[PDB]
Structure formats: structure tokens, C-alpha cells
């Protein structure tokens, strides 16, 4: 019925008419030069899609996809390997036309068969959540350059997400299981190719100079550097010192003390290094500490509420962090879907049927993480923590909390990446000790952190909840019970309340008017159950770089736009 060259999850695509290049690029940007970047931890293989292993920097971008997303919109799709698509009004089937000029790096064509092969490969050797999400979906080459996708139930976002699948060359991947790590880079297709590396230490990408899609609208003014090099550092302090010394070119500064007090010295005086701070109005990544609620120590909501009360954010922000941070308080932070007011009538129609299985505060209060006076030793909050612990059966015997029936101490392990700056850890450990709670600290390397995060082999560990601009069907992978082993369910929660709210969200894909009370209602359930302990976020981007680059006039809303930068040989000439 319909045929289009652009798509959007909600509303209309911004570049629907006369699309020559994005607003946030310089179409005339020159090619050449190197950018060197840091990475924290280590890596051991090149397959981002395997069941295990520690994949190298940028290995999620080795392959082009059927459509690609703009960076100044939440979810709009524009042609890459595909030229266009025909589709049913409900998006339950689509026929994708493949660009006949599309090529892998060895010069061979990308065909409809490669896409069909790619879907079956993920279905049979991929991450276990893929065959669950696309249960009943088929992907079939119906012509040499036409792929037909059919969904067994309506899912406009699930359809559009298949446009982001990497398109694998069958001629290489027929000889490699998708679940196995790769010691060597696979045959690929994107604008940059791995050309050298040292296992665990560096990866070098080279610009593909005859890249078949270099002049497509989505690519104009992007992929300008001839070389992108990643050097690995074991902790962020030595990385920050290497940046100041000139060892790499660009730093995203996530430490408040570094920004407030350490952007000093010869290289800043002579303006060799540029420091930039821009406010950011869009959806925000948030930091949390995950409670593993499958372990007895964190199975009681009252214990999780009490440990949250012991986390003195106002003191940390004032005494340690130069008042730089804002407190995390939503799984839809800084969007319309955050539950920052009282439930309206539409939300109550969604929530009231489940009042038996909900904390009563969902209906009567706005969720607010604990606030202290910032002086330290908050009497009100620590008295309330004691009150909740006693009710849950953890009582003081001597100086240590002990189960009132068994007599087993209240004790747990905080699992920590050795690479992180963790100035907040000892203050939190001290506050818990004053409640009689023992928290052991275990710092481990990047490979053990990845292995144990995936298997949930922890009592508590830090987790980042990525920015979610609308209530996406991805939510089921992180929260719904059948996806408990996807590696994205940090607390280990299997709740029929969550499941019903997310099943309604998945049934309303692409329908904003109904996703709005659904998202706010889900936010209330996730926050009021204290599945995780809210830390902090900042709505500004703090960046610094050596002055060898120039940038477009406009920065994209949803990323920093580094792939639109270029090497400026006049500015570079002025550096030592």
C-alpha cells in the first residue's frame, strides 16, 4: 500500500523531503588525519555478538545495516544498504529493496540472501533473547535484491529494529559459529576496517578509501579521519594523566574533581587543550547500584529501602563532588515519561487493577530518593533505616546486625571495576558500618567484571541505565520475566506487575498517546520497589580535546557527533 525512503518510531522523520545531508554535518569536511582515543579495561576478541568474551572497542560498528538512525532525532531511519521499502499500514510486513551498489570489504555484493542468512544465524546461534523477541518472524529473499520481513504480531518498533541488524557475509560466516569469540576480525562492510591490533592493548581502524556508500546522504560529511586508534588503560587516573600528557586526543570527563581542579598546567595555559561544557536538554543516562534480589540478603524490600537511606548523596555532592551532580530519580530521566507528578486518571485505570501487588505509595506520593542536610550523619534517615531493618528481622547484637532468628550477620559484597574512580565507596561503607551492616569491597579486572555482570554473580554492583527517550519494546529484555537471562536484568526481577505493564507497552508500539501513561506507570513500579539504588547524572557534557579538530556549526541532540569532526591542519600545525 505504501512505499517510503524514511521511517520514524513516533511521528514523522525530520529528513523526509529533499534529504541531501544532515543538519549537523559540514558536507564539505576534508578527509585525512588520525584521532587517538582511550578505552578502559581490556579486550580479547572481535565478535560483539558472541555468547562470551570481552569484545574490542567499536566492534559493534564493523557492519553497515539496512537503514541507519539520525543523531538529532530519537528514532528515525534513513537509507544505508537498503534504498527503500514497501510496507503494510500496520508495519506487520515490509519488502526491503537492496542497493545494487552495496559491497563487503572484499568487493563482493551484499544481497537479499545475505540478509536472510543473517536473520537465521541470529535465530540459531545468537544471544538467547533474539529468538524470543522475533519468535514467529520470518526473513526471506524473495528476489536477488528484495528481502521480505513478516512479523507474527504487530510491532512497528520490532520491525524498525531489524533495520539496525548488521548484515553478515554468508561466504565468511558459514564457517564460524556466531556464539564463538573471534581471535581475528571478521569479513566486514562499514566505513572503517580493523587493520592492526595488540590483544588487550590497542586496536587501529583505517578509513576504507573506496567505501561504496561514502556519498550517500547519511554518510556525507562523516567518517573523515583516515585512522581511529584505541589505546587501553587499566584505570581512569592513568588515562587522565596520559590525556594531559598528549597520549590521546579527546576526553569525556566524568570525574567532578578532575574537572573542578585538574584542568591546569602548561598545555592549558598555551591553549593546546580546549575545554567545553554544553547543557543538554534530551534523555539522560543514569547511574545506579543494582541489588541482586535473588540473594537472601536483598530479598526484602525493607532491607533495600534501608540500605538506600544509608547512601548520603547530599554530603557526597557537597564534600566530594563540587555540587556537580543531580540525583537520579527516574528510568525515563528528563523526558515527558518520567513520573514526576501525581498519577492522572489514565494511569490509575492502568494501576488500580493491580493495587494488591503494588506499594501503596504508587498512588499517594511522588517518588523521591532520600535527601539529607549534607552535613553528614543524617539522624532522620539513619533512624528510619534502623526502623526498617528491625521490622525485616535484622537486629543489632553488639555492633553488628544479625538475623533475629538465625543469628547470621547482615553482610554483602560490593563488586567494583578496578578501572573506576570510586571516591563514594568508603563513605558508603562507613555509613553502613554505623548501621551494623558489613559491606566487603571486591575490585576486579575488566574481564571478570564482564563475566560476573552477565551471570549476575554479585550481591551488589554499579550499573548504568542508558537514556530511554520513550517507552521502547527493548524494556522487556531488561525487565520482563521471560528475559531474566538476557544479561540486562540487573536486579534479577520476575514480576507479574512489570510483565503486564510491559506487555501493554509492546502492544502500543508507535502509539505515543497511550505510551505516555504506560511509561509513567512503569516508572512508578520500578522506582517504588527499590530494585536499584539511585546514584547520579549530569545534564551537561564535559569534554576536552587537543586543538587539532574542527566541528560543524550544529551538534546533534542525541550524541556528541565526533564522527562529524575532521582534522584541521591549520590548528594542528600550532601544537608542539
Amino acid at each position: 500500500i505504501k512505499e517510503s525512503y524514511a521511517f520514524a518510531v513516533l511521528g514523522e522523520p525530520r529528513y523526509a523531503f529533499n534529504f541531501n545531508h544532515f543538519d549537523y554535518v559540514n558536507p564539505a569536511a576534508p578527509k585525512g588525519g588520525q584521532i587517538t582515543l582511550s578505552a578502559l579495561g581490556t579486550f580479547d576478541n572481535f565478535n560483539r555478538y558472541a555468547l562470551r568474551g570481552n569484545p574490542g572497542a567499536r566492534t559493534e560498528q564493523l557492519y553497515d545495516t539496512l537503514f541507519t538512525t539520525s543523531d538529532d532525532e530519537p528514532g528515525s531511519y534513513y537509507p544505508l544498504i537498503a534504498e527503500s521499502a514497501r510496507y503494510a499500514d500496520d508495519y506487520s510486513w515490509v519488502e526491503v529493496a537492496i542497493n545494487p551498489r552495496a559491497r563487503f570489504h572484499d568487493g563482493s555484493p551484499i544481497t537479499a540472501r545475505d540478509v536472510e542468512f543473517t536473520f537465521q544465524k541470529f535465530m540459531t546461534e545468537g544471544v538467547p533473547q533474539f529468538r524470543l523477541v522475533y519468535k514467529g518472524t520470518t526473513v526471506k529473499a524473495i528476489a536477488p535484491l528484495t528481502v521480505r520481513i513478516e512479523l507474527a504480531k504487530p510491532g512497528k518498533e520490532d520491525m524498525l529494529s531489524l533495520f539496525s541488524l548488521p548484515v553478515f557475509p554468508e561466504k565468511y560466516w558459514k564457517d564460524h559459529k556466531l556464539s564463538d569469540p573471534l581471535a581475528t576480525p571478521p569479513l566486514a562492510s562499514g566505513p572503517y576496517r580493523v587493520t592492526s591490533w595488540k590483544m588487550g592493548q590497542n586496536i587501529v581502524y583505517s578509513r576504507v578509501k573506496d567505501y561504496w556508500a561514502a556519498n550517500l546522504p547519511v554518510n556525507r560529511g562523516r567518517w573523515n579521519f583516515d585512522t581511529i586508534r584505541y589505546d587501553y588503560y587499566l584505570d581512569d587516573n592513568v588515562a587522565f594523566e596520559a590525556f594531559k600528557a598528549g597520549a590521546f586526543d579527546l576526553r569525556m570527563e566524568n570525574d567532578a574533581k578532575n574537572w573542578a581542579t585538574r584542568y591546569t598546567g602548561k598545555n592549558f595555559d598555551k591553549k593546546y587543550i580546549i575545554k567545553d561544557e554544553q547543557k543538554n536538554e534530551s534523555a539522560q543516562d543514569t547511574r545506579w547500584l543494582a541489588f541482586n534480589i535473588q540473594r537472601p540478603v536483598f530479598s526484602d524490600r525493607r532491607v533495600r529501602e534501608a540500605i538506600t537511606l544509608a547512601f548520603d548523596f547530599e554530603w557526597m555532592n557537597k564534600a566530594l563532588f563540587y555540587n556537580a551532580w543531580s540525583r537520579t530519580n527516574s528510568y525515563f530521566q528528563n523526558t515527558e515519561y518520567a513520573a514526576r507528578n501525581y498519577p492522572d486518571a489514565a494511569e490509575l485505570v492502568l494501576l488500580a487493577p493491580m493495587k494488591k501487588d503494588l506499594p501503596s505509595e504508587v498512588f499517594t506520593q511522588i517518588y523521591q530518593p532520600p535527601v539529607s542536610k549534607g552535613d553528614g550523619y543524617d539522624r532522620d534517615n539513619l533512624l528510619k533505616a534502623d526502623k526498617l531493618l528491625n521490622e525485616a528481622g535484622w537486629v543489632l547484637k553488639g555492633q553488628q546486625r544479625v538475623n533475629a532468628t538465625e543469628a547470621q550477620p547482615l553482610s554483602f559484597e560490593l563488586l567494583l571495576p578496578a578501572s573506576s574512580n570510586s571516591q563514594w565507596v568508603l563513605p558508603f561503607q562507613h555509613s553502613l558500618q554505623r548501621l551494623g551492616i558489613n559491606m566487603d569491597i571486591r575490585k576486579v579486572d575488566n574481564s571478570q567484571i564482564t563475566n560476573r555482570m552477565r551471570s549476575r554473580d554479585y550481591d551488589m554492583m554499579p550499573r548504568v541505565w542508558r537514556a530511554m527517550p520513550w517507552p521502547s519494546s527493548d524494556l522487556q529484555i531488561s525487565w520482563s520475566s521471560e528475559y531474566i537471562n538476557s544479561t540486562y536484568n540487573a536486579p534479577g526481577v520476575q514480576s507479574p506487575v512489570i510483565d503486564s505493564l510491559i506487555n501493554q507497552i509492546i502492544a502500543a508500539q508507535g502509539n505515543k498517546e497511550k505510551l505516555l501513561p504506560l511509561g509513567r506507570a512503569l516508572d512508578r513500579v520500578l522506582t517504588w520497589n527499590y530494585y536499584m539504588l539511585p546514584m547520579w547524572y549530569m545534564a551537561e557534557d564535559r569534554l576536552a580535546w587537543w586543538d587539532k579538530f574542527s566541528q560543524p556549526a550544529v551538534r546533534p541532540i542525541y550524541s556528541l557527533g565526533i564522527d562529524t569532526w575532521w582534522y584541521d591542519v591549520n590548528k594542528a600545525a600550532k601544537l608542539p
Binding site: 555478538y49 569484545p55 559493534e60 544471544v127 548488521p166 564482564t450
Partner: peptide
């Protein structure tokens, strides 16, 4: 994420 494990 439907195509890869957490990192």
C-alpha cells in the same frame, strides 16, 4: 539489546 550481551 536484542543482538548482543551487556558490556
Amino acid at each position: 539489546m536484542r543482538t548482543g550481551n551487556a558490556x
